[PDB]
Amino acid sequence: GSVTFEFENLSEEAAEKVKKYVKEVAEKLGVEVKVEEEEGKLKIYVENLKEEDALDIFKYAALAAELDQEYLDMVEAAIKAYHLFKEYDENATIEITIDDEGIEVKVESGDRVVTLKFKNVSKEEVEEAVKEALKQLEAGQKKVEVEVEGG
Amino acid sequence: GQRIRVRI
């Protein structure tokens, strides 16, 4: 499977690190990689990966990007989510987005749409929401929306 | 403010 990773508003220095270290990882794994950078914008496309690889690389890109722990937690949360949904449907379209407010997960799986949005939330909470979403899908629900805001 | 995204 092929995967795209995107960063907005990294410093030049940080983006350079991401590029360099994504390259290294990929060539160590013998896989094709496309990196695109404009002002404020970095995008990485890797093409035929075992999921486990993909999720490793994404994690290291984030480290290389010098993101703080709150961002890193959400990255790990996103890791768990991507996995669990792929376990349900290997052909699900999964878009996970992280920013300074929180995290948002969009899944399209056959004719099933799932949207999960979180602000100021623990990684644990996200997992639990994902498992619940999957329960609903498993019981035949077509659409599941979840929204959570820490207090 | 940073945004990160993983797709596909």
Residue numbers in the entry:
A (entry chain B): 210 to 360
B (entry chain A): 1 to 8
What do the study authors state?
We obtained a 2.3-Å-resolution crystal structure of a variant of C104, C104.1, where all the surface residues outside the interface were redesigned using ProteinMPNN36. The crystal structure recapitulates the designed model, with both individual domains clamping the peptide in a β-strand conformation. The individual domains superimpose well with the design model. The majority of the peptide is resolved in the electron density and binds in a β-strand conformation with the apolar residues buried in the designed cleft. A deviation from the designed model at helix 3 shifts Tyr91 towards the peptide binding pocket in the crystal structure partially occluding it. As a result, peptide residue Ile8 is displaced and the last few residues of the peptide are disordered in the crystal and are not modeled. For design C104, we confirmed binding in an orthogonal SEC binding assay. Single-amino acid substitution of the buried residue Val6 in the peptide of C104 to arginine completely disrupted binding in BLI, suggesting that the designed binding mode is recapitulated. While the apo state is dynamic, the X-ray crystal structure of a designed binde−peptide complex is highly ordered and very close to the design model. The shape-complementary binding pockets in our designs nearly completely engulf the bound peptide.
We describe a general approach to bind such segments in β-strand and β-hairpin conformations using de novo designed scaffolds that contain deep peptide-binding clefts. To design binders to peptides in extended β-strand conformations, we sought to create scaffolds that could provide β-strand pairing interactions to all the backbone amide and carbonyl atoms of the peptide, such that the peptide strand complements a β-sheet on the scaffold. Starting from FoldIt designed proteins with mixed α/β topology, we designed additional strands and helices to create scaffolds with a single central β-strand missing from an extended β-sheet. The sheet is buttressed by α-helices that pack on one another to support the structure in the absence of the bound peptide.
